[PDB]
Design an enzyme around this catalytic site. Structure first.
Site, PDB file in Angstrom:
ATOM      1  N   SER B  46       0.799  -1.221   0.000  1.00 51.75           N
ATOM      2  CA  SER B  46       0.000   0.000   0.000  1.00 51.75           C
ATOM      3  C   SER B  46       0.837   1.279   0.000  1.00 51.75           C
ATOM      4  O   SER B  46       0.264   2.358  -0.176  1.00 51.75           O
ATOM      5  CB  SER B  46      -0.989   0.002   1.179  1.00 51.75           C
ATOM      6  OG  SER B  46      -1.737  -1.214   1.264  1.00 51.75           O
ATOM      7  N   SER B  94      -6.200   2.687   3.139  1.00 52.99           N
ATOM      8  CA  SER B  94      -5.499   1.826   2.180  1.00 52.99           C
ATOM      9  C   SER B  94      -6.468   1.050   1.282  1.00 52.99           C
ATOM     10  O   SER B  94      -6.437  -0.179   1.201  1.00 52.99           O
ATOM     11  CB  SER B  94      -4.555   0.866   2.908  1.00 52.99           C
ATOM     12  OG  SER B  94      -3.574   1.559   3.658  1.00 52.99           O
ATOM     13  N   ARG B 222       4.570  -0.942  13.743  1.00 55.87           N
ATOM     14  CA  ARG B 222       5.227  -0.132  12.722  1.00 55.87           C
ATOM     15  C   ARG B 222       5.388   1.312  13.185  1.00 55.87           C
ATOM     16  O   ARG B 222       6.493   1.865  13.158  1.00 55.87           O
ATOM     17  CB  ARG B 222       4.446  -0.194  11.407  1.00 55.87           C
ATOM     18  CG  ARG B 222       4.323  -1.590  10.819  1.00 55.87           C
ATOM     19  CD  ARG B 222       3.351  -1.621   9.649  1.00 55.87           C
ATOM     20  NE  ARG B 222       1.986  -1.297  10.041  1.00 55.87           N
ATOM     21  CZ  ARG B 222       0.974  -1.175   9.192  1.00 55.87           C
ATOM     22  NH1 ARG B 222       1.144  -1.324   7.888  1.00 55.87           N
ATOM     23  NH2 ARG B 222      -0.237  -0.892   9.663  1.00 55.87           N
TER      24      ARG B 222
HETATM   25  C1  LIG Z   1      -1.396  -2.503   1.892  1.00 48.78           C
HETATM   26  O1  LIG Z   1      -0.280  -2.724   2.232  1.00 48.78           O
HETATM   27  C2  LIG Z   1      -2.556  -3.318   2.418  1.00 48.78           C
HETATM   28  C3  LIG Z   1      -3.258  -4.200   1.380  1.00 48.78           C
HETATM   29  C4  LIG Z   1      -2.684  -4.038  -0.009  1.00 48.78           C
HETATM   30  O2  LIG Z   1      -3.154  -5.564   1.792  1.00 48.78           O
HETATM   31  C5  LIG Z   1      -3.494  -2.448   3.281  1.00 48.78           C
HETATM   32  C6  LIG Z   1      -4.348  -3.299   4.218  1.00 48.78           C
HETATM   33  C7  LIG Z   1      -3.888  -2.978   5.611  1.00 48.78           C
HETATM   34  S1  LIG Z   1      -4.486  -3.827   7.020  1.00 48.78           S
HETATM   35  C8  LIG Z   1      -6.286  -3.887   6.791  1.00 48.78           C
HETATM   36  C9  LIG Z   1      -6.855  -3.448   8.127  1.00 48.78           C
HETATM   37  N1  LIG Z   1      -6.229  -2.222   8.604  1.00 48.78           N
HETATM   38  C10 LIG Z   1      -5.623  -2.129   9.810  1.00 48.78           C
HETATM   39  N2  LIG Z   1      -5.083  -0.999  10.172  1.00 48.78           N
HETATM   40  C11 LIG Z   1      -2.931  -1.988   5.519  1.00 48.78           C
HETATM   41  C12 LIG Z   1      -2.156  -1.350   6.587  1.00 48.78           C
HETATM   42  O3  LIG Z   1      -1.128  -0.645   6.198  1.00 48.78           O
HETATM   43  O4  LIG Z   1      -2.478  -1.481   7.758  1.00 48.78           O
HETATM   44  N3  LIG Z   1      -2.694  -1.663   4.208  1.00 48.78           N
END
Ligand SMILES: *C(=O)[C@H]([C@@H](C)O)[C@H]1CC(SCCNC=N)=C(C(=O)O)N1
Ligand SMILES: *C(=O)[C@H]([C@@H](C)O)[C@H]1CC(SCCNC=N)=C(C(=O)O)N1
Ligand SMILES: [Cl-]
Ligand SMILES: [Zn+2]
Ligand SMILES: [Zn+2]
EC number: 3.5.2.6
Lengths: 237, 237
Positions: B46, B94, B222
């Site tokens: 993301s 995201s 993170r």
């Molecule tokens: C990007 O890295 C991802 C996706 C492409 O898999 C998104 C999904 C999430 S976690 C989903 C729930 N959110 C929790 N905070 C992230 C993230 O960076 O947390 N990016």
């Protein structure tokens, strides 16, 4: 517009008097503790940094938010002022000498025309070009502040979109996982200002407040009282 | 570049492994716990939302940060995705379906040329245009992320200044009286990303971190690990 007299408890419980005005953008509805004082005009003081910075950017007096304005070498009482600044720190520290320099370069003619095109307050620049917003004749009310701020938020002021985005950047005050506040403080030894907006996921709440500030003791009450109203109304957690 | 092996305590005390990279803009000097992993390339996941949003804005696929992208009506597992979004909330949550739509409208030809002009990672878009940053061949390292971010901060990427300011607006994550963080998270079920910068009164510190993330349990590490390093180095209070 709707008057909620119960908000006065936020002022009185701090032995304070003043007004808080809110505007729900999605619903086009406004709320205030005191409708009269909400439409009472005051000196803008350092809140004039918003229109001033817009005109300076649009006219090329300021190039961008990182351009350095050299301190003129005159030491003034506010310690933060006696140093080099950019637009970001000039706004954060309310650095009057920088904004006076902006106004001088803009000039009376361009200043007056631009404030009229902005429909800002009473549109009266009398009489010192570099100090009228502090001790001259310009006055603006809380509801007129919100009117001006709504146009800025939507990039609808009569200046470049770029100038408006840069000033909105410089207005950044607070941000977390729930909200963003862009705003500007003001203080003229008699009254204190806090004007701006709260950005949410799906809405924006504009705000303008002022209160009697006889002494510098309680300048922090400007933000504190505002946030307590926002909390009461479930705008922020 | 300078390796400070003592920063590894921040990872190990959380039973974690990874890298934190910092770059002092004013001094042009970088610091990291592990020089090797700092130059190890991974899927951007993301974090690709930053280059993707820049190209979309410059090409007119996105008009501005408040334009509404209608949900396509397919319900996906992440609850926040199944709704209308703008650029601000697409970045915060995201929202992959929005960025896949961006990529489809951009196309393979324009995507590949633009990533080359950005000098982004390995510049390999193989092979699904709407999913290469998730399960294709593009890879980027932490030091290459900082290289890309420095250009964005200075408006020096090969796209309009307006596109760059809007993306930097959408990157806003945190702000108080001491600092501003603009950044972007990423997670691909194996590793977790946090890339961005910390704006101060008189300097900027760029950062890029990644860590092993076998399970969603500790995604919060993170930001937490990064802030602990910033605190140790007296970058933030
Ligand atoms: C990007 O890295 C991802 C996706 C492409 O898999 C998104 C999904 C999430 S976690 C989903 C729930 N959110 C929790 N905070 C992230 C993230 O960076 O947390 N990016
Ligand atoms: C603007 O309203 C004034 C100036 C024109 O008098 C500046 C000065 C101050 S108070 C100086 C010390 N700062 C404390 N925080 C402010 C203010 O809004 O606090 N604005
Ligand atoms: Cl911003
Ligand atoms: Zn005109
Ligand atoms: Zn070119």
């Amino acid at each position: 517009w709707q008057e909620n007299k119960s908000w006065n408890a936020h002022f009185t419980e701090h032995k304070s008097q003043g007004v808080v005005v809110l505007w729900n953008e999605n619903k086009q509805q406004g709320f205030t503790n005191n409708l009269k004082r909400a439409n009472q005009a005051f000196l803008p003081a350092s809140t004039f940094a918003i229109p001033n910075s817009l005109i300076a950017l649009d006219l090329g007096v300021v190039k961008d938010e990182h351009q350095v304005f050299k301190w003129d070498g005159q030491t003034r009482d506010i310690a933060t002022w006696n140093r080099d600044h950019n637009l970001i720190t000039a706004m954060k520290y309310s650095v009057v000498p920088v904004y006076q320099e902006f106004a001088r370069q803009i000039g009376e003619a361009r200043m007056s025309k631009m404030l009229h095109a902005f429909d800002y307050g009473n549109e009266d620049i009398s009489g010192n070009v570099d100090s009228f917003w502090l001790d001259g004749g310009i006055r603006i009310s809380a509801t007129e502040q919100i009117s001006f701020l709504r146009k800025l938020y939507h990039n609808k002021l009569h200046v470049s979109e770029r100038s408006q985005r840069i000033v909105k950047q410089a207005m950044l005050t607070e941000a977390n996982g729930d909200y963003i506040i862009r705003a500007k403080t003001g203080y003229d030894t008699k009254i204190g200002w806090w004007v701006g907006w709260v950005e949410l996921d799906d809405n924006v709440w504009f705000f303008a407040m002022n209160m009697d500030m006889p002494t510098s003791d309680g300048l922090g009450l400007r933000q504190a009282i505002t946030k307590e109203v926002l909390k009461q109304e479930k705008i922020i957690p």
